[PDB]
Symmetry: C2
Subunit: 397 residues, 2 copies
């Protein structure tokens, strides 16, 4: 098949590499990004590791007419949106007009699903499929849930998503993304769902020490996360769902200190005559995020702790995946964060092009059969585990 | 008498003010500097407070000719050097040539090194004595008052002093998450320098900020105190007899140290230029632009400071321990002389040293450190100029 991928960032790289490692499904690969050089750098690594060639081009993903044009010239069977979230809607419109399947790893943001779910009837009518959040979280976390709902429970009551990155880059402080993102995670109020109500919290207000398998105990804080919005819709009998994420104390200290002196401001200021932007100086001071991939060591562990009922008795399982940073860099020239997000995308595409995951309209992961997806994960470098946990019942006569 | 002050920084404004409050001795005041706006700031506060007028003029304290010329024009009876430490030598040469008494509050430091010592200044002794001129070194609180406290205890409370612990605490709060009173480069050297103290005729170094102890400062409470080196240790080991050990400890909040280390880590304290969208940018200059203006802090600082000496020795065959100290309130310092307690505790003492020389209560020919002179008239002026002290029998 001929595929067109948009986006050459860290995740974008892993996706292209993984597609180049499955040439029986992805025969002709076209990679398009705003900056041509990023695309070249990826082709360079793909070629060097012996995975073949890939066509590279650029494009203004903000222009529908341009995207339509590019799609009409390449004639792809599926378009992978591994680009910025603020381009979902324009890429989806292009796909709708050309009648070509769509897949992305993050919802719209100018973040919720409303805008994307809005393309549903138009997609179904055009006879086109659109898959959403095909990453690890959202994505594999969604599949773990649907898979658990299919083979381990009759009813799922509580779901906790636990995301931990123990990776260590060797620097006092260094961010993997654009500082504005890191600030947003710890600045936004936390949100979760219980008994059909969305409950908010103060930023980083709720924390627990969870012992992540193969990693050990870590402080885990409660944050909002996009899959919570589709899981409450799909998992039947759900009473509560929360999302937790790992946060080292050293890291939280640097962020707060930087924010305190205003090193995270976006407005301009006068510095010896010339106008400068606080956060831009930070980006220029912190080490290059690209270079962190070869220095990061340690493991990551993301998964779901699920409590429900099975054959009338309480049950509790823990489905998760552990990934090693150094291994990821050796295989696809990227760290575990990009890796865990990129493989699931390659898989969702593979499934869609093979017909194991077909439909007409816009879909979330939990809506499709997880079995073929779960088999691929064990084969593509993201082996998962199911661990039976303590499930105590209290009878009262 | 006519006096000449060089420099118009925080301490400088305090010195000028206090001098303006003692016209009996300082009847004509001239403030030499390279920053008019700063002098203007000070002159306005002095006038509005009812303490008269002062003459501001400009001069480059790097030029010996300018100084000599300025001094020959003004005919001052004393020159108060409240300028930068690297300028100590040029101002001393000028005073020497014009035969005018000299006084400063910080010892010489070459701009190329971070080493501050008395060597260069002590080397002027014979020329000053021969010329019949007096030079008083480090006339601030520490060094300065701490030295007098020690000379005081040795004259009245001990036959022999064996141990001195100089404790400096600033409990002040400017309300901001983080903010310095000085050029960040300075706050950074304070905590980057090796620690150093003296024991049994020997100098002992430590890793920066290694030794620390919780000390309960009167009117302030228990604070984490760290062992730092300080300039008065160098003269005190010379002048205090029987001394076995001397150490300097300074207070440091945890939040403060956290911000400092964090900032130094991401590179916000670098002085070199980096590129930012094709534009050369000095990190620390961006930091100075984000932090509040040091001048605006004086009016926002609340809280106290406690500086003193913990002394143990022998008095009439028996062991004895005394604690001499001073407590200064930040807000009171702002109301009275338009400055914070850091500036105030260093400034008032410089004024008293000049007062004692101009009245002749402290007279000698050559270069002198505070502990070589009679501390009584100094200790008296302290109770009278806003730095009342207390002696606590341990």
């Amino acid at each position: 098949a001929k595929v067109l991928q948009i986006g050459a960032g860290g995740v974008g790289g892993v996706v292209a590499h993984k597609m180049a490692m499955n040439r029986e499904v992805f025969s002709h690969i076209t990679l398009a990004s705003r900056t041509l050089s990023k695309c070249q750098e990826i082709a360079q690594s793909i070629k060097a590791k012996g995975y073949g060639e890939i066509d590279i081009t650029t494009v203004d993903a903000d222009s529908i007419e341009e995207l339509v044009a590019l799609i009409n010239e390449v004639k792809p069977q599926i378009v992978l949106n591994i680009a910025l979230p603020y381009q979902d809607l324009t890429i989806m419109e292009a796909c709708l007009r050309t009648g070509v399947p769509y897949l992305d790893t993050a919802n719209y943001e100018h973040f919720e699903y409303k805008e994307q779910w809005a393309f549903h009837d138009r997609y179904k009518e055009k006879g086109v499929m659109a898959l959403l959040g095909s990453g690890f979280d959202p994505g594999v976390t969604n599949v773990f849930c649907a898979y658990a709902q299919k083979h381990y429970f009759d009813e799922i009551h509580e779901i906790d998503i636990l995301d931990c990155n123990a990776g260590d880059h060797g620097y006092p402080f260094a961010t993997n993304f654009n500082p504005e993102i890191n600030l947003r995670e710890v600045s936004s109020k936390g949100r979760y769902w219980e008994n059909g109500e969305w409950i908010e919290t103060e930023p980083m207000e709720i924390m627990q020490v969870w012992d992540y398998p193969e990693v050990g105990p870590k402080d885990s804080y409660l944050l909002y996360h996009e899959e919570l919005e589709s899981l409450v819709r799909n998992i039947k009998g759900l009473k509560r769902i929360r999302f937790f994420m790992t946060f080292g104390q050293s890291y939280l200290t640097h962020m707060r200190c930087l924010e305190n002196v205003g090193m995270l401001r976006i407005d301009e200021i006068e510095v010896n005559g010339c106008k400068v932007v606080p956060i831009q100086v930070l980006k220029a001071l912190l080490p290059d995020p690209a270079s962190l991939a070869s220095r990061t060591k340690g493991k990551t562990n993301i998964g779901c702790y699920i409590k429900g009922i099975k054959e009338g008795k309480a049950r509790t399982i823990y489905i998760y995946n552990v990934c090693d940073h150094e291994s990821c860099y050796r295989e696809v020239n990227a760290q575990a964060i990009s890796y865990t997000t990129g493989v699931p995308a390659m898989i969702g595409a593979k499934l869609m092009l093979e017909g194991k995951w077909s439909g007409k309209g816009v879909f979330n992961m939990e809506e499709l059969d997880p079995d073929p997806f779960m088999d691929e994960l064990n084969k593509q470098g993201l082996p998962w585990e199911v661990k039976e946990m303590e499930a105590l019942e209290h009878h009262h006569h």
